[PDB]
JSON list of C-alpha atoms in Angstrom, two decimals:
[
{"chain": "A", "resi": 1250, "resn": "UNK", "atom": "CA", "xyz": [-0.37, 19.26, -7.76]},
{"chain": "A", "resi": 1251, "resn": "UNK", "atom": "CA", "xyz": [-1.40, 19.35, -3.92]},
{"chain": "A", "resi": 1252, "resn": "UNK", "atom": "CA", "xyz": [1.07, 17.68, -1.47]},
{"chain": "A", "resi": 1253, "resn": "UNK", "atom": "CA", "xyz": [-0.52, 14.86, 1.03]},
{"chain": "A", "resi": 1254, "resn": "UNK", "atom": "CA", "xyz": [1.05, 14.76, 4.05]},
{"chain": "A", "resi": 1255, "resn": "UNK", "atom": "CA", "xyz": [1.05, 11.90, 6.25]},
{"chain": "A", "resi": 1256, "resn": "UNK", "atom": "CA", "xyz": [1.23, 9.32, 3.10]},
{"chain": "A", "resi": 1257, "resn": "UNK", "atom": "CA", "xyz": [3.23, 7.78, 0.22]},
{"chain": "A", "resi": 1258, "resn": "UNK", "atom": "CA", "xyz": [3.46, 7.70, -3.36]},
{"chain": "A", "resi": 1259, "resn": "UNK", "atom": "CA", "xyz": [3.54, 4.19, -4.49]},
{"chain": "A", "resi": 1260, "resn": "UNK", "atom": "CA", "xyz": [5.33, 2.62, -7.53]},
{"chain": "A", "resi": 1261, "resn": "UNK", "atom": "CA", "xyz": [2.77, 2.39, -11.07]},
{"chain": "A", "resi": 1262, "resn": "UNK", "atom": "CA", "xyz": [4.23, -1.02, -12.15]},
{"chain": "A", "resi": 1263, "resn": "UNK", "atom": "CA", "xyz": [1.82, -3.78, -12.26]},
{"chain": "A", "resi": 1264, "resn": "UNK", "atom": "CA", "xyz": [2.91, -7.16, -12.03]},
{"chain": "A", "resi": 1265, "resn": "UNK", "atom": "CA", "xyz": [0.65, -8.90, -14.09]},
{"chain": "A", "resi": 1266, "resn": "UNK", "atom": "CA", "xyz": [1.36, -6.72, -17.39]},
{"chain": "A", "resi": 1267, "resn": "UNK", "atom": "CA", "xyz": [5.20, -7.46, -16.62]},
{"chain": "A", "resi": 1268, "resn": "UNK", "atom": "CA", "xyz": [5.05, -11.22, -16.13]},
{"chain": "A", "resi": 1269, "resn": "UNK", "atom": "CA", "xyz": [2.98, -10.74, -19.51]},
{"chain": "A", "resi": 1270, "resn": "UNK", "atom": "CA", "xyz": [5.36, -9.00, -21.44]},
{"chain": "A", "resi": 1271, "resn": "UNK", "atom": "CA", "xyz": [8.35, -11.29, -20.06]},
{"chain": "A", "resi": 1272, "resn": "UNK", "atom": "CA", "xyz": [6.29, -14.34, -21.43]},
{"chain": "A", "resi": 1273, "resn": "UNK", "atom": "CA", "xyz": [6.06, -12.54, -25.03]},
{"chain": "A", "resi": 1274, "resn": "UNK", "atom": "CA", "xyz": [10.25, -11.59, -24.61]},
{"chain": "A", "resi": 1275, "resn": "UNK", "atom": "CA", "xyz": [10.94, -14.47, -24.02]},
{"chain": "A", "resi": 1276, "resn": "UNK", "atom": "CA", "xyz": [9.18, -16.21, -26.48]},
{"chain": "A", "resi": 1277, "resn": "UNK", "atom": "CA", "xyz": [11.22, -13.07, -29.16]},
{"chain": "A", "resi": 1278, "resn": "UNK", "atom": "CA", "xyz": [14.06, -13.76, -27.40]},
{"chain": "A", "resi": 1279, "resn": "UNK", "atom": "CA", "xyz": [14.01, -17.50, -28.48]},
{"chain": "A", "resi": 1280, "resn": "UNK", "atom": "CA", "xyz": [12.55, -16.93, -31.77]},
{"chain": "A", "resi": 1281, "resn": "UNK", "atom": "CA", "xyz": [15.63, -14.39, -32.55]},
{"chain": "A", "resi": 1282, "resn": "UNK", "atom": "CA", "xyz": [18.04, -17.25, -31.03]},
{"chain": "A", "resi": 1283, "resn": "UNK", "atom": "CA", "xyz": [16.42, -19.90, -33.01]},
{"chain": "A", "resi": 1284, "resn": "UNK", "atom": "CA", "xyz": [17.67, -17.20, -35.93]},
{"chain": "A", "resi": 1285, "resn": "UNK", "atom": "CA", "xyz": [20.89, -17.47, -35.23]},
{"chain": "A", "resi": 1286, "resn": "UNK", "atom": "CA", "xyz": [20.78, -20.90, -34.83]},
{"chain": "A", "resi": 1287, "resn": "UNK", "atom": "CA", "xyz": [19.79, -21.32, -38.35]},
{"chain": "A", "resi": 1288, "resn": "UNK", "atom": "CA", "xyz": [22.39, -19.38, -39.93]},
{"chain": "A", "resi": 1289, "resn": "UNK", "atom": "CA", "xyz": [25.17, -20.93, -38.28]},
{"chain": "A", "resi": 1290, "resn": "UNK", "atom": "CA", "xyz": [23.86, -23.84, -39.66]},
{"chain": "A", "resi": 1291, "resn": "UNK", "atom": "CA", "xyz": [23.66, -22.29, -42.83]},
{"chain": "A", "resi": 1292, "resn": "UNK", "atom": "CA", "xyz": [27.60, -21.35, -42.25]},
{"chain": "A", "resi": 1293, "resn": "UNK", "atom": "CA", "xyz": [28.20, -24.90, -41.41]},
{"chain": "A", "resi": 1294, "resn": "UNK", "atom": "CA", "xyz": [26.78, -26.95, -44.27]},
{"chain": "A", "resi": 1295, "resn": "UNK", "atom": "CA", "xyz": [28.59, -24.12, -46.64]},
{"chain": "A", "resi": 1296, "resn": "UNK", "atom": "CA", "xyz": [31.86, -25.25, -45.07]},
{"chain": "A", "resi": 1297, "resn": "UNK", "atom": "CA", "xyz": [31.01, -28.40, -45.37]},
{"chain": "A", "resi": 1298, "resn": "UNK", "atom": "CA", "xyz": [31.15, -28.68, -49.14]},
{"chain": "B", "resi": 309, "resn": "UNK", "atom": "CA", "xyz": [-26.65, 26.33, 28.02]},
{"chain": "B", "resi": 310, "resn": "UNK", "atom": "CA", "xyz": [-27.63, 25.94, 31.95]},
{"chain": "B", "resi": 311, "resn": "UNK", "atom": "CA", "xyz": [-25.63, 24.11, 34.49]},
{"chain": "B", "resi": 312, "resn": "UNK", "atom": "CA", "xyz": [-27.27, 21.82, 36.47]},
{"chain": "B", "resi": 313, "resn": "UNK", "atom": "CA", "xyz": [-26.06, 20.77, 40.19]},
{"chain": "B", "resi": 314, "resn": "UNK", "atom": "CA", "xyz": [-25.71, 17.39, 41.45]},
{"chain": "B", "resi": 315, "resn": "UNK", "atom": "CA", "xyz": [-25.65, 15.31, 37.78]},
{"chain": "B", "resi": 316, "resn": "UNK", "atom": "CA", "xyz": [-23.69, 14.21, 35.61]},
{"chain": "B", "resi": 317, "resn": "UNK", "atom": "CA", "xyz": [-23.87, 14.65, 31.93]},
{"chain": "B", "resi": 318, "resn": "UNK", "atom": "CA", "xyz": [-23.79, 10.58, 30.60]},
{"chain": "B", "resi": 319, "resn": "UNK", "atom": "CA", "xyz": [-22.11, 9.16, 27.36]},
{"chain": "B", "resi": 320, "resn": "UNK", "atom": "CA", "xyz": [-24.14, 9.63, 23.86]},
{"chain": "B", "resi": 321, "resn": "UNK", "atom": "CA", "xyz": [-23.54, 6.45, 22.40]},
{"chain": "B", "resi": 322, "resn": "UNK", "atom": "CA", "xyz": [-26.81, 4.05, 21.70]},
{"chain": "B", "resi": 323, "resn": "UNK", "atom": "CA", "xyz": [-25.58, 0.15, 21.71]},
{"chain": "B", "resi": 324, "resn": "UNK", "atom": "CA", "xyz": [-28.26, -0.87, 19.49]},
{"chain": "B", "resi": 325, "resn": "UNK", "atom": "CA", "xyz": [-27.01, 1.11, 16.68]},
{"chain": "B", "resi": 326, "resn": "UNK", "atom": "CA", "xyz": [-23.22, 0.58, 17.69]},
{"chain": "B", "resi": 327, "resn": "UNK", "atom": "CA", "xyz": [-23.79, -3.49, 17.13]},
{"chain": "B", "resi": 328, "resn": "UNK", "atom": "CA", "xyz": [-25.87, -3.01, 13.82]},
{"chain": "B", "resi": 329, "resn": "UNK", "atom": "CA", "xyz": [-22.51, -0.58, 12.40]},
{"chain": "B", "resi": 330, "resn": "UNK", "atom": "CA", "xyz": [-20.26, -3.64, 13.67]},
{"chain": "B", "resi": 331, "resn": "UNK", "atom": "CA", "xyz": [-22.65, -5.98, 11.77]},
{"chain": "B", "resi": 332, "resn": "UNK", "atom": "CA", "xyz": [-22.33, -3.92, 8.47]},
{"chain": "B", "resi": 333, "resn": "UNK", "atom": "CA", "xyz": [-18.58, -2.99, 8.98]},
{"chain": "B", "resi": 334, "resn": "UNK", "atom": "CA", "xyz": [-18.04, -6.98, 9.59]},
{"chain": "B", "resi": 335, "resn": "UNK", "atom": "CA", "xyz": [-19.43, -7.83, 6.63]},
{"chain": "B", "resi": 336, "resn": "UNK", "atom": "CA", "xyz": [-17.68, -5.21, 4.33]},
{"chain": "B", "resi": 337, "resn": "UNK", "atom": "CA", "xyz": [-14.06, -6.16, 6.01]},
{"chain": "B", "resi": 338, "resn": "UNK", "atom": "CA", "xyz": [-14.69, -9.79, 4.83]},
{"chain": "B", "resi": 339, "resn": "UNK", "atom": "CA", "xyz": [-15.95, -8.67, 1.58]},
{"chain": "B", "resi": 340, "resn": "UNK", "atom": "CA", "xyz": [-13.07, -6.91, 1.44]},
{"chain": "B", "resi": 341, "resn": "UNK", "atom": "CA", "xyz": [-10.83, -9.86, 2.12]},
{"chain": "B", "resi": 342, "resn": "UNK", "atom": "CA", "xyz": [-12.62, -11.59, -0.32]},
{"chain": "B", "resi": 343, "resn": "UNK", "atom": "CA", "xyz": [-11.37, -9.08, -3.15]},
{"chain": "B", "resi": 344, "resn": "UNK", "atom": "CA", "xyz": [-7.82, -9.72, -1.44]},
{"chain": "B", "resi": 345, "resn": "UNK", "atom": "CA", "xyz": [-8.04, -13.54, -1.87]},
{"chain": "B", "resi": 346, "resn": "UNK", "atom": "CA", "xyz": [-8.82, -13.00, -5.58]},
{"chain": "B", "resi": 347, "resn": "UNK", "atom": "CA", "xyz": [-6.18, -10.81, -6.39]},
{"chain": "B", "resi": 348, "resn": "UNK", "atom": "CA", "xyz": [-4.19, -13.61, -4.32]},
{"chain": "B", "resi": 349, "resn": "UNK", "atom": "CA", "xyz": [-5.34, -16.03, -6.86]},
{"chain": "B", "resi": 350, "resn": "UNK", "atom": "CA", "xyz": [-4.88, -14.36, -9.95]},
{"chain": "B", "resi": 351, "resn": "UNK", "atom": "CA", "xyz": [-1.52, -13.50, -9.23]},
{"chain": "B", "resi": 352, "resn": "UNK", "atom": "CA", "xyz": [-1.10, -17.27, -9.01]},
{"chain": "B", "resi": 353, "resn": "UNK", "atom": "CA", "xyz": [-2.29, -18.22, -12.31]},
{"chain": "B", "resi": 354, "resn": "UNK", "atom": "CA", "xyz": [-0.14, -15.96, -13.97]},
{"chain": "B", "resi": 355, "resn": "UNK", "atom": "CA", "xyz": [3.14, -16.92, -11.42]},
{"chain": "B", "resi": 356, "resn": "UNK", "atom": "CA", "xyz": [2.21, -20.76, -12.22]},
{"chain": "B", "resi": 357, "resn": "UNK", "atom": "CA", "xyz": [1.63, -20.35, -16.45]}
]
């Protein structure tokens, strides 16, 4: 492609779409530790016996 | 072109149609500023959720 001189490239990211997908990582994140949270559980009540 | 003595060639610029343009580039600066102020605002939804 053609240069432009006299200007700048800016970044691509927009910040809506990320504060969008950090909501729905977040909420994987958590269901994923919620996961774990059950299995130790799990472990627990097995000692238990 | 011909050179005439004792004048002056004067400016080319007509006021009337020098205060219309600042009229219309008035209003599309604050129209402008108006599409700032809602990308202002939808930021904050999304920084507030």
């Amino acid at each position: 492609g053609k240069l432009t001189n006299g200007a700048l490239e800016a970044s691509n990211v927009d910040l809506s779409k990320e504060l969008v997908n950090m909501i729905v990582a977040q909420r994987n994140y958590q269901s994923n530790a919620q996961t774990i949270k059950t299995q130790d559980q799990i472990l627990n009540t097995l000692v238990n016996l």
